[PDB]
Amino acid sequence: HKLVLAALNRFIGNPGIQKCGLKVISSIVHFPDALGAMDSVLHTLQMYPDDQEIQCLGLSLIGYGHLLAKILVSSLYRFKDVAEIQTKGFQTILAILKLSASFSKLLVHHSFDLVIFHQMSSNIMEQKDQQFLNLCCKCFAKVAMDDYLKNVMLERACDQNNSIMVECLLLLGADANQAKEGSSLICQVCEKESSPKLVELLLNSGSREQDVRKALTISIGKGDSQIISLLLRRLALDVANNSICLGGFCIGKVEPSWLGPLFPDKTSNLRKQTNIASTLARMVIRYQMKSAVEEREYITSLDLSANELRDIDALSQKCCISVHLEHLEKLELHQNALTSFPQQLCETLKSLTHLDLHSNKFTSFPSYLLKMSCIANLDVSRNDIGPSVVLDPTVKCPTLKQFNLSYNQLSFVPENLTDVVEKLEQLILEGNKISGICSPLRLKELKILNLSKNHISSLSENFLEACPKVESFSARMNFLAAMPFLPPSMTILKLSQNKFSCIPEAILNLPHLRSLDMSSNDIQYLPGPAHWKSLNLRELLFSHNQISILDLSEKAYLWSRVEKLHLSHNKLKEIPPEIGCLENLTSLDVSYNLELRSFPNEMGKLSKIWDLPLDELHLNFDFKHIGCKAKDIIRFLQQRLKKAVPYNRMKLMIVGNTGSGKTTLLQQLMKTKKSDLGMQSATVGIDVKDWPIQIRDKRKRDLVLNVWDFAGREEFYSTHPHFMTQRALYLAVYDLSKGQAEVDAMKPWLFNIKARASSSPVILVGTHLDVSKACMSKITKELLNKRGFPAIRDYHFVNATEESDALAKLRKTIINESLNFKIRDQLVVGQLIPDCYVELEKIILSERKNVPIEFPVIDRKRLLQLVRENQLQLDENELPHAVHFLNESGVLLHFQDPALQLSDLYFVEPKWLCKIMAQILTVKVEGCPKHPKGIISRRDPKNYMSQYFKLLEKFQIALVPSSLSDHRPVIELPHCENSEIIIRLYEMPYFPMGFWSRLINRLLEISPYMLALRPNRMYWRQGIYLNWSPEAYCLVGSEVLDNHPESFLKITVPSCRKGCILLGQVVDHIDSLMEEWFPGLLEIDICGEGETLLKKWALYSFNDGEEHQKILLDDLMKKAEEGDLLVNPDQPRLTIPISQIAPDLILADLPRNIMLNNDELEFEQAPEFLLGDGSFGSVYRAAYEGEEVAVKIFNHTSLRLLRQELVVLCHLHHPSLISLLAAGIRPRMLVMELASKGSLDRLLQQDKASLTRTLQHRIALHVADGLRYLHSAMIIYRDLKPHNVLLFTLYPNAAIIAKIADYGGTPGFRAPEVARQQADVYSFGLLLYDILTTGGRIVEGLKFPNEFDELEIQGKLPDPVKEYGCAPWPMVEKLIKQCLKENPQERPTSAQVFDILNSAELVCLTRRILLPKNVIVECMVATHHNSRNASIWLGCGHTDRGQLSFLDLNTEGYTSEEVADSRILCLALVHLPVEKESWIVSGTQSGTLLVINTEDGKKRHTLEKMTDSVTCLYCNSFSKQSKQKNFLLVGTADGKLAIFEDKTVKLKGAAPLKILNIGNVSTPLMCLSESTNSTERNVMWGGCGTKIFSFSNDFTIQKLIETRTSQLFSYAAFSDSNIITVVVDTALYIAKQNSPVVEVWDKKTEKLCGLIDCVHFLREVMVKENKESKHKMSYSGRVKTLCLQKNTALWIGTGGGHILLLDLSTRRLIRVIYNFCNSVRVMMTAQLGSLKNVMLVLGYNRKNTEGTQKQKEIQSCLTVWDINLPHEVQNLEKHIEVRKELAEKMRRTSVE
Ligand SMILES: C[C@@H]1CN(c2cc(-c3n[nH]c4ccc(OC5(C)CC5)cc34)ncn2)C[C@H](C)O1
Ligand SMILES: Nc1nc2c(ncn2[C@@H]2O[C@H](COP(=O)(O)OP(=O)(O)O)[C@@H](O)[C@H]2O)c(=O)[nH]1
């Protein structure tokens, strides 16, 4: 019982008894392992806390419900640091967790954090219980198992400021951008007044930039000077570029105490005290993996434009930066609201040369801005400068160049220019209010004046009489009358919008003038080219004048260079033929004249014309179906210059109805005697026949009209519209037996004749007198004549079987009607064509005398062979029109239609192919009607069955829409309550025949409605009724309402949100058809009234449901109700939104947020407010509730086009796309993002100082991404060029830099056009080329612009670095070539080019130099003393004897010169500060140490001949003699340090100061190094044999560290071999011959503190991409050389074809950059041409071209990397990830 009694007695013993009871139970707990005390021993703790002597015991006994934990920490917290009782506690926790894992989560539940934080931070480090502390890292490692536990405790770890532990947690993961995304870590960390080290650690690791900006706003709220300067240093600083990009931020005020540390400071050097955190992180990681596995120096200018600086005086003082400003050389203050530029500032900075501050609110040009030392381009161009701007004459500033004064409120030209600004060039004064006549203006160097938009009366006669270099005087929009003796030097003169009456003779005589724009003048006579006295006229812009003649008869060749001639809006009469001499004409413009009417054939010689607007003028020809475009018009005018002839050979379409005198009247018109077939049957198809008529009269014109006796029976009634062209003479026939009743039923036919060919004649012909009613002439005169039916021109009553004069009269009438057609007096029947067409027609007809009957088609190859067989003058560009024209004449049908596919096949003999297309429509099936009537599958010879229905369903006969269930099946809509449906009518007098056949076939195949779920559809002849659901369905019905002889087209669609989509997408397909095939219907006949024959109604009802009637409304009149949005009757209390009865016209269908209310508008449209022109309209700027927002206004255009654009540009959200904000119906225009820094063309035109390669690459990458998305959206751009790319910010590493405008071409932007997909790739190639070029492609657009598609694969293209001089930039120079394949199949995809652009290597490298063929070189030395242009001196080893091998870099010219009798090993540079020379030294195989001068390759003197092979040379920094001093080291193959002095090199056989024999004959000296710092007096370290050594100015071995005696043998010879390399840093990194591992010694302890293996980094990559590497287990690959950067990383040069980056501080591998060489032999650092700190890499590329001959072809591929690589490989890495998250977050807005 003792256990039971002891426990219960200790329980009841509330006073005193516990102190002993606990000792009794702690002794007894070991022996029986007893069994119900835990609860009571728990209870007693609460029952009396606070007694240490029992607390320790209780904790000791807990280890032998959750309230347990609640007492534990509350104990350890109540005894934080009283004694080592925490030991017993943490032992208890460690015991409990290892058996109950989840209890750990319970511990952190209560208070664990409070006490563990305290213990790990109560200064426990270097206190004696370091082993107890090891148990506690062991605790934490299991504590931080759950990542969420890391994040939330991290949250708590920043609440209380604790730098060491927050750093430790960051090293353990625990991302710092997860808390709230609106109030995430940095926000409260700057709110709670934390420490700079706490904020810096948060910023350095993952911290989203938006949160940083929010925290910047917060920390601006308070006054903090060490947290602000750390937020800016991560938000705005480009250290690579020396910048401050503080642009977008809304900083309330700038104070130098913030930017203080942003400027570079040489004193900045900080120790390593946070190593505690790294050590603790290492211990935690160790315990975690154990628990896991088996348990000068001045910056550039400043960001300043849009900051609304109401004052800039803050910088005028003598503050911290008042000495860095003195070398600014560019200052931008435009668009702020400044005033009165501070006088102290404008003399503080004495090197400013682009000061521009416009759009500010100045009111007085300071006139003390001009006392700066070297200023130019002074620009104040939108301020409110006072009425006069006189310059004070006490300033003599000559350096000013471009003194802009645009758009001020001036009243005079500035007064004292001539005495102040002498060298002034571009004095601009436009937009002012200059009124009075100007000054004599004695400026000696004006080069571009300007006076536009002033109010000038006239110019003084001595205005330009003293400015002998003016070039571009341009006074637009003034009130100007004459010109005052312009100096003979003007080149460009622009004088538009003035008030002239004739070109003043002061212009007709300028001896060098080049362009003259005088548009919008009211002038009368344009003097002939014999009045212009100038040999170089290029542009002559004269639009909007009143010009009568275009005098060119006098002397035309004197204007042979003219390239632009704009004469629009003039009273011209005709173009004189002398215009044919201006061969260099490029852009003629004679539009809007309304009185020109004819083009002379002479213009066909002006082949350079690429545009020729034809707006509002009528020509002979110009008929759209045959009308040419651009050069095609010139080709037409040139072929018409050759020879145009009368063609005289037309058509007669006979038309009947189911029976009449048609065939028996055609067989009587043709007088056909044969009667071969004694019994003709009903007509099949159209049966084309032809019959010549040599009219035996004075007119010998033997006219041949072809008769097409159309099908009578109604069954053929769908194809006939195809054979009714506009050019014809139709008959029609009665069968007068059913007189006055058949004549009624003939009405549809005439109607169709009025539908297709409005201006075609018709001839009625009675066909029966033998069969009996002849009063039919009544009704044809009574009803049929002139009411909506075509221009009947006769009627006859022949027998059409035999014996009468009436037939002769019918013949005469037909002949005389044919010879009298002449529509619009154009006379079709004899019009002129090139004889080539007639020849082609003749040869084709003669092949109607030779073809296969089974397949009358001709292949295009056969046609191009038959043109060769004859002597036709046609090329591959003539046939595309030739065959079309011959199609127009009924010779052969060929299909070029975009709706189908272009036919390689040619349908000569149409007479049987029309016969073939109708066979299917007559074959029936009286077998088993297994399918509903009309639908059928493939059921019928040699491959012809394939082409038959490869034509017929291309002909949309497939399921035959004809003979298809005329009676409609009964259909009921889910909802028919008069208010959930939308209904639209199409009342028309009679359906077109193939209307339904082609209507149900256009709606049918559009399956992806509201995209890919197909609907169920049950479609009879005249209806569809698709359905997805009761939420989406459509019934395009066909009913006739009672007492309505017309025929309607009822469409019903639910008024739901998606139903409006159905409506719109169906009305588009029903309207576009009507204007594509039936232009007669939707042709408003102003003659009579606007019937339009197509009265598209709209049905609306006020009474929601049970309206008892649907109220009509004509759609046009409803469209007139667009000034509002709601319709309402004469009774105005109730109304229906137009948004409820026609949601398709209505704006709301795309995301509803697009709506412009016309309320909070803010706008202007003057010629400053547009931003550019493009496609179908232009774009302007305005504001609304916004500030700046762009508006795309439209021309002329239509709400067809806009509906396309609305949908297609919407529903597409992408970072590279220019998203639109709103649309405006009333204002007929759209709204877009304002592109802040301009367009790419502008950027190229101006800003070439500021295009970094990074930046160019960013733009290209952004663009590559947009184009990729556009192909994700499966579509062409078709508009890619500098004019179309928009730039937002000029900050290189931003998130949005470039975007792409208007969507699916130019001489400056050509391709081999598909119609003359993969094409946009090529267009991108052009843009990319120019971006690489920076303005080379169309600067030539001022010069030789036709040449832009002439050298198409052939131009400056072969070497554009060479052809433009731009900075070399490989990989992408290969990318454009490799992209730019002429064949579209050969081009890579846009996704592929985007992926290749997303490659840090494409951004990081600039050149290599493949040395001459088979040269082996193994040593090289750079030159930094002449840092202007440097040459890299190489050795050789292709020869066993020594050649030196010079190699320059700016010329890349290799030279060879044998200088030694034995192969060289190494060289070095010893430059002497005296005598200004750099002796170059070379050590060799024989020991013959050679020294040769820099410039002289003859003053050579080998020094003492060494004993063994010299392995090394080196030049040190040893100034130990109180002066500048240097030495030289000769590493030989034995260790003998033959040291010398910097100057003693000249004397033959130099004297070694201290000959230090170090190594042995078997231990070869093999590497030397200097130290990393200079504070250790440059202790020198050199490897020797296998033991590294060191020395100093003493030149005595200071250490004999041995490496072979290593205690970590994984292999021996990797350390048991001769040393190869040594580098001196905080530690030592060493490698040996063929050692694939590097050894890391320490200088003090001399211990192998590191062992870093190379193939330890080769595995990770090879495993996927090298499968043959599984056979290469005995791997080649080892450290062939070392090269260490200053403090960032270390570059391992492999013996293989690889290179390794090592971040020596924290993470081992940054990147391996392979596949660029095969053996990295040499590596070193250097400086070149102010591009200091480059790293040269001499690698090998062996070619086994003759490897079978045991020989390899060697190319020493010397490359030059930019040493800044280890940053960009980790910084650009990051930059992708940024844009990847943003790629996804943006696509969330597409979801919702
Ligand atoms: C420098 C000036 C130039 N600017 C622009 C803006 C734009 C522009 N923005 N948004 C657009 C949307 C469409 C668009 O279609 C083009 C390419 C057809 C002209 C242009 C812009 N295009 C040139 N320049 C903006 C102002 C503030 O700055
Ligand atoms: N007796 C008689 N028959 C005629 C006359 N004109 C046409 N027909 C008949 O019309 C038929 C000619 O075919 P047509 O009607 O032109 O062919 P369809 O239009 O394809 O049916 C023959 O059967 C003729 O006998 C006429 O004046 N007298």
Other residues' Cβ atoms within 10 Å of the Cβ of residue 809: 14
> In degrees rounded to 5, what are phi and psi of residue 973?
-75, 150
Distances (CA, A) of 259 to 302, 392, 729: 11, 37, 89
Report the separation in Å between the CA atom of 651 and the middle of ligand 2, taken as the mean of its atom positions: 22
Amino acid occupying residue 3? L
What residues are designated binding site? 656-663, 1171, 1173-1174, 1177, 1179, 1190, 1192, 1232-1233, 1235, 1239, 1242, 1283, 1286, 1301-1302, 1363-1386, 1560-1563
Which of 1177, 1277, 1257, 1172 lies closest to 1217 in space, CA to CA? Answer: 1277
Contact predicate 1528/1539, CB 8 Å: yes
Supply φ then ψ for residue 1408, to 5 degrees.
-140, 160
- Tokens 């005249």, residue located: 1022
Q: Is 1528 helix (H, G, I), strand (E, B) or coil?
A: strand
| Cβ atoms within 10 Å of 32's Cβ, excluding its own | 8
Helix (H, G, I), strand (E, B) or coil at 1527: strand
Q: How many CA atoms lie within 13 A of 449 on its CB side?
A: 27
φ and ψ at 1765, to 5 degrees? -60, -50
**Which residue has 């018109």 as its token pair?**
669
On whether the CB atoms of residues 1148 and 1063 are closer than 8 A, the answer is no
Residue 1406, token pair as written in the block: 């600039």
Cα–Cα distance between 802 and 808 in angstroms, integer?
A: 11
Does any ligand 2 atom lie closer than 6 A to the CB of residue 664?
yes
Q: For residue 967, how many other CB atoms are within 10 A of its CB?
A: 9
Count H helices and E strands in the chain, helices first.
43, 59
CB 186 within 8 A of CB 213: no
Two tokens at 628? 């040419």
Closest CA to 184 of 202, 168, 164: 202
Which is the catalytic residue, given 517, 1279, 1330, 1625? Answer: 1279
Cβ neighbours of residue 898 under 8 Å, at least 6 residues apart? none
Distance CA 1658, CA 870 (A): 70
Burial environment of residue 1321 by CB neighbours within 10 A (0 to 12, 13 to 18, 19 or more): buried
Helix axes 196-204, 228-235, angle to 10 degrees: 10
CA-based angle 212:215:220, to the nearest 5? 125
| Residue position matching structure tokens 């030991």 | 87
Decide if 1279 is catalytic.
Answer: yes
d(CA 1395, CA 1265): 9
Strand partners, 1443: 1458
Tell me which H or E stretch contains 138. Answer: helix 130-143
User: Hey, is 1552 helix, strand or coil?
Assistant: coil
Residue written as token pair 């080219």 = 529
Distance (angstroms) between ligand 1 centre and the Cα of 1497 equals: 60
Resolution (A): 7.8
Asked if residues 571 and 547 have their Cβ atoms less than 8 Å apart, the reply is yes
C-alpha to C-alpha distance for 199 and 65, rounded to whole angstroms = 41
Instruction: Tell me what percent of the chain is helix, strand and coil, each rounded to the nearest 5.
Output: 30, 15, 55
Task: Report the SS3 class of residue 1419.
Answer: coil
Residue of 658, 664, 765 best suited for mutating to test ligand 2, as the one with most atoms within 8 Å of CB: 664
Beta strand 1580-1584 pairing with 1619-1624: unpaired
User: Which two structure tokens, joined as six digits, stand for 964?
Assistant: 């298809």
Both structure tokens of 709: 């006796």
Distances 911 to 139, 850, 905, 1136 between C-alpha atoms, Å: 96, 15, 16, 57
3-state secondary structure of 1416: coil
Burial class (CB in 10 A: 0-12, 13-18, 19+), 1361: middle
In terms of Cβ atoms closer than 10 Å to its own Cβ (0-12, 13-18, 19+), residue 718 is buried
Specify the length of the chain in residues: 1792
Contact yes or no for 572/593 (Cβ under 8 A): yes
Q: Please report which ligand is nearest the Cα atom of 665.
A: 2
Q: Which residues of 1064-1095 are buried (b: 16+ CB within 10 A; e: fewer)?
A: bbbbeebeebbeebbebbeeeeeeeeeeebbb
Distance 990 CA to ligand 2 centre (A): 27
Give dist(CA 1759, CA 1747) in Å, integer.
Answer: 25
CB burial of 1560-1569 (b: ≥16 within 10 Å; e: otherwise) equals eeebbbbbbb
What letter would DSSP give residue 1306? B
Compute CA 964 distance to the chain's CA centroid, rounded to the nearest angstrom: 51
Nearest to 205 by CA among 1776, 1741, 1784, 1774: 1774
Instruction: Please tell me the distance from the alpha carbon of residue 172 to that of residue 1046, in angstroms, as a whole number.
Output: 82
Helix orientation angle between 879-888 and 835-847, rounded to the nearest 10 degrees: 70
Query: What distance in Å separates the CA atoms of residue 428 and residue 470, rounded to the nearest whole number?
Result: 12
What count of other Cβ atoms lies within 10 Å of the Cβ of residue 877?
A: 12
* Distance between CA atoms of residues 260 and 254, nearest Å: 11
- 38-47 helix and 52-62 helix, angle to the nearest 10 degrees: 160
What is the number of the ligand closest to the CA of 765?
2
Q: Please name the amino acid found at residue 1464.
A: I
Distance from C-alpha of 504 to C-alpha of 513, rounded to nearest angstrom: 14
Query: Which residues, in sequence order, are CB contacts of 865 under 8 Å at separation 6+?
Result: none
User: Residue 1233 CA: which ligand is closest?
Assistant: 1
Q: Which residue has the tokens 């028309």?
A: 988
Two tokens, residue 207: 């911290």
Between CA 1476 and CA 1480, with CA 1477 as vertex, the angle to 5 degrees is 160
Nearest to 301 by CA among 248, 362, 244: 244
Residue 1627, helix vs strand vs coil:
coil
Helix ranges (H only) for 704-834 are 742-745, 747-756, 776-782, 805-818
SS3 1771: helix
Q: Is 1004 exposed, middle or buried (0-12, 13-18, 19+ CB in 10 A)?
A: middle
For every residue of 385-431, DSSP letters joined together read --S--PPPTT---------B-TT---SSS-TTSTTT-SS----B-TT
Q: For the stretch 154-193, what's the b/e string if a residue is b when 16 or more beta carbons lie within 10 angstroms of its beta carbon? A: bbebbeeebbbbbbbbbbbebebbbbeeeebbbbbbbeee
Instruction: Give yes or no for a contact between 1449 and 1429, defined as CB atoms under 8 angstroms apart.
Output: yes
61 sits in which H/E element: helix 52-62
Cβ contacts of 1700 within 8 Å, gap of 6 or more? 1654, 1657, 1691, 1692, 1694, 1709, 1712
If we measure between CA atoms, which residue out of 1587, 1579, 1692 comes closest to residue 1646?
Answer: 1587
Per DSSP, helices labelled H in 875-958 are 879-888, 910-916, 944-952
Which single residue is written with the structure tokens 């037909």?
814
The alpha carbon torsion through 1716, 1722, 1726, 1728 (nearest 10 deg) reads -50
**For the purposes of burial, counting CB atoms within 10 Å of the CB of 1169, is it exposed (0-12), middle (13-18) or buried (19 or more)?**
middle
Binding-site members for ATP are 1171, 1173-1174, 1177, 1179, 1190, 1192, 1232-1233, 1235, 1239, 1242, 1283, 1286, 1301-1302
H or E stretch including 1640?
strand 1637-1641
Structural domains in the chain, CATH included, are: 491-642 (3.80.10.10), 643-672+682-695+703-738+745-776+787-833 (3.40.50.300), 980-999+1020-1060 (no CATH), 1096-1131 (no CATH), 1146-1159+1196-1233 (no CATH), 1240-1398 (1.10.510.10)
- Interatomic CA distance for residues 1459 and 1484, integer angstroms: 11
Rounded CA-CA distance 1456/1458 in Å is: 7
Residue 1612: other Cβ atoms inside 10 A? 10
- 1684 contacts 1691 by C-beta, under 8 angstroms: yes
Which DSSP state fits 16? S
d(CA 890, CA 874): 20
Exposed/middle/buried for residue 1643 (C-beta within 10 Å: 0-12, 13-18, 19+): middle
DSSP string, 201-255: HHHHSS--HHHHHHHHHHHHHTT-SSSHHHHHHHHS-BTTTTB----S---S---
Whole-angstrom Cα distance, residue 1307 to residue 1317? 20
Closest atom of ligand 2 relative to the 768 alpha carbon: 27
Q: What are 1169-1175's contacts with CB under 8 Å, separation 24+?
A: 1171/1235, 1171/1239, 1172/1239, 1172/1283, 1174/1279, 1174/1283, 1174/1284, 1174/1301, 1174/1302, 1175/1279, 1175/1302
Distance separating alpha carbons of residues 149 and 143, to the nearest angstrom: 8
Dist CA 1654 CA 238 (whole Å): 34
CB 348 within 8 A of CB 328: no
**Among protein residues, the one whose CA lies closest to atom 6 of ligand 1:** 1235
Contacts of 676 (CB under 8 A, 6+ apart): none
Torsion from C-alpha of 1597, 1601, 1602, 1605, nearest 10 degrees: 150
Q: CB within 8 A of 887, min separation 6: which ones?
A: 893, 894
The CA distance from 245 to 1603, in Å, is 51
Q: Which H helix or E strand runs over 1220?
A: strand 1220-1224
Nearest residue to 1597 (alpha-carbon basis) of 1586, 1618, 1585, 1582: 1582
Nearest 5 degrees, angle CA 369-CA 375-CA 380? 55
Residue 522 Ramachandran class (φ > 0 left, ψ -120 to 50 alpha, else beta)? beta
Which spans in 981-1137 are helix H?
993-1004, 1059-1077, 1115-1120
What is the three-class DSSP state of 639?
Answer: helix
- Quote the ligand 1 centre to 1329 CA distance (angstroms): 23
State the Cα–Cα distance between residues 920 and 922, nearest whole angstrom. 5
One-letter amino acid of 128: K
Q: Which two tokens stand for residue 966?
A: 């005329």
H or E, element range at 517 = strand 515-517
How far, rounded to the nearest angstrom, does the alpha carbon of residue 1012 sit from its chain's CA centroid?
29
Answer whether 1234 contacts ligand 1 (Cβ < 6 A): yes
Alpha carbon distance, N-terminus to C-terminus of the chain: 73
Closest ligand 2 atom to residue 682 Cα is 20
Q: Which residues of 485-522 are buried (b: 16+ CB within 10 A; e: fewer)?
A: ebbebbebbbbbbbebeebeeebeebeebbbbbbbbbe
Cβ-based neighbour number of residue 1571 at 10 Å: 19
Within 13 Å of residue 1689, how many CA atoms lie on the same side as its CB? 22
Residue at token pair 């002993």: 20
How far is it, in rounded angstroms, from Cα 935 to Cα 961?
A: 8
- CA quadruple 781, 785, 786, 790: dihedral, nearest 10: -160
Residues 6+ positions from 1385 with CB-CB distance below 8 Å: 1318
CB 1314, CB 1321: distance < 8 Å: no
CA angle, 996 then 1002 then 1007, to 5°: 135
Way it was determined: cryo-EM
Residue 371 contacts residue 399 (beta carbons within 8 Å): no
What contacts 1614, CB < 8 A, 6 or more positions away?
Answer: 1632, 1634, 1635, 1636, 1637
At position 1364, the amino acid (one-letter code) is: Y
Q: In whole angstroms, give the CA distance from residue 698 to residue 694.
A: 11
> Residue 1589 — φ and ψ, nearest 5°?
-135, 175
